[PDB]
Amino acid sequence: TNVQILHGDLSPDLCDLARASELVGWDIETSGLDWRNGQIGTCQLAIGDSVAVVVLGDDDHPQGLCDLLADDGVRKIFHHAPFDIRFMAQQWDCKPRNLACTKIASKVLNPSAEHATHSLKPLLKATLGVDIDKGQQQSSWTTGVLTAEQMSYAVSDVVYLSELYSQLRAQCLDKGVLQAVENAYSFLPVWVELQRRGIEDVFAY
Amino acid sequence: TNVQILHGDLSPDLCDLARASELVGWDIETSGLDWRNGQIGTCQLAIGDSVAVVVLGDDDHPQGLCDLLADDGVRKIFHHAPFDIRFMAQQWDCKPRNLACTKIASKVLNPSAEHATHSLKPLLKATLGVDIDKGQQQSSWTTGVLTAEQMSYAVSDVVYLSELYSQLRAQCLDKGVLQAVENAYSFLPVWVELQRRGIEDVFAY
């Protein structure tokens, strides 16, 4: 894994590589859970054998990252895409396209499992035998400065997503639920627009 | 409008006509809002120029209606499909396919409107200039007996759905949101399976 640290936006070279990539792993770190009035601190992208950690500041509107997020020709893989894409769509006024989610896949595969088993850490252990440390999850991500410990945590949160997705995708195919999962993925851009306009669940009364 | 009253299941002639129809309007009446342990009292279907009201009894498992609901080659139009398909999927152990919803279309078109405007009665008035009377909505639908007033209400709840859908579909095309609406429709079979297995919102944490 080739780790790069950036600020303000993704580099043009990595934007180009992302457009040619099969899959782009994506995660964010934030001020908290407040997608409306909070702040994105980092974007971490896994592009090929590279992981890029982009440190963001107050009122950053990264054009390269938003163009990538909005590009329907680039497949983005998240763990719990709803959280990340809602934060980015609202904070950047960005329309995300071509989105996939390992947590949604886990839930469609095993809907009656205990809720905790769908979290990234247990899911990585159960699916790939990979152990990650979530200790820095609740650190302060929005100061424009990263510690080495934060960098390690940020890389670990994104670097396994493409492999996790590929394994979960295979499990969905084996069970005959991949089309169902893909129908959930195709609704994600609609879901987040509804969120921004105040419809919290279009399927509720 | 040619109205027919049936019991137990849809007639074979109407099942055949439904398979050749562009659209099939569908509504149900029930014991209440309890889709898990309640009871379906009627199914009302709009097939061509016909409306069929099928009166159902305790523990009815209508094979013809479930086959139609599960047939991906038959386009069903509901108003608030989530309510109806969840009731039918749970009560009949049926897998619904190829579903559309005038309420979801209304919400994607006008997500910031007052919630009441998405109800069938105001939506029919605003879109088609049609007035319906909802007085019999909260009657007792599960006794195996229908009054003439209940029959009139049941017909009115389904007979305008194909026209309402066509008008809303045109509005979605004009605004450029039809693909978004169709992505919501394609998630409905996944949504209801998740509901039955206890995932109330796969997009929540």
Author numbering:
A (entry chain A), B (entry chain A): 2 to 206
Study authors write:
To understand the molecular basis for the specificity of dimeric NrnC homologs toward DNA substrates, we determined a set of crystal structures of diDNases: (i) a complex of diDNaseNoc with dpGG to 1.55 Å and (ii) diDNase from Rhodococcus (diDNaseRho) in its apo state (1.72 Å resolution) and in complex with dpGG (2 Å resolution). In both structures, the 5′ phosphate of dpGG forms a set of salt bridges and hydrogen bonds with the side chains of conserved residues K104, H80 and Y206, the latter of which is contributed by the second protomer, and the main-chain nitrogen of L121 (per diDNaseNoc residue numbering). The side chain of Y206 also forms a π–π stacking interaction with the 5′ base of dpGG. In diDNaseNoc-dpGG, the side chain of the conserved residue Ser120 engages in another hydrogen bond with the 5′ phosphate, whereas in diDNaseRho-dpGG, it points away from the phosphate. Additionally, L34 splays the two bases of the substrate apart in the same manner as leucine wedges in dinucleases NrnC and Orn. In the diDNaseNoc-dpGG structure, the C-terminus of protomer B is pushed deeper into the active site of protomer A than that observed in the NrnCBh-pGG structure, creating relatively less space for the 5′ end of the substrate. In NrnCBh-pGG, the side chain of residue H205 forms a moderately strong hydrogen bond with a distance of 2.9 Å with the ether oxygen of the 5′ ribose, while in diDNaseNoc-dpGG the side chain of Y206 repulses the ether oxygen of 5′ deoxyribose, pushing the entire nucleotide away. Coordination of the ether oxygen in diDNaseNoc-dpGG is restored by the side chain of residue H81, which donates a hydrogen from the other side of the substrate. The third discriminatory feature is the apparent restricted movement of the side chain of F84 in diDNaseNoc, which engages in a perpendicular T-shaped stacking with the benzene ring of F88. However, mutating F88 to an isoleucine residue alone or in combination with H81F/Y206H in diDNaseNoc resulted in significant loss of DNase activity without an increase in activity on diribonucleotides.
Dinucleases of the DEDD superfamily, such as oligoribonuclease, Rexo2 and nanoRNase C, catalyze the essential final step of RNA degradation, the conversion of di- to mononucleotides. The active sites of these enzymes are optimized for substrates that are two nucleotides long, and do not discriminate between RNA and DNA. The active sites invariably consist of (i) a catalytic DEDDh/y-containing core for divalent cation coordination and catalysis, (ii) a leucine residue that wedges between the two bases of the substrates and (iii) a 5′-phosphate cap that coordinates the 5′ phosphate of the dinucleotides. Here, we identified a novel DEDD subfamily, members of which function as dedicated deoxydinucleases (diDNases) that specifically hydrolyze single-stranded DNA dinucleotides in a sequence-independent manner.
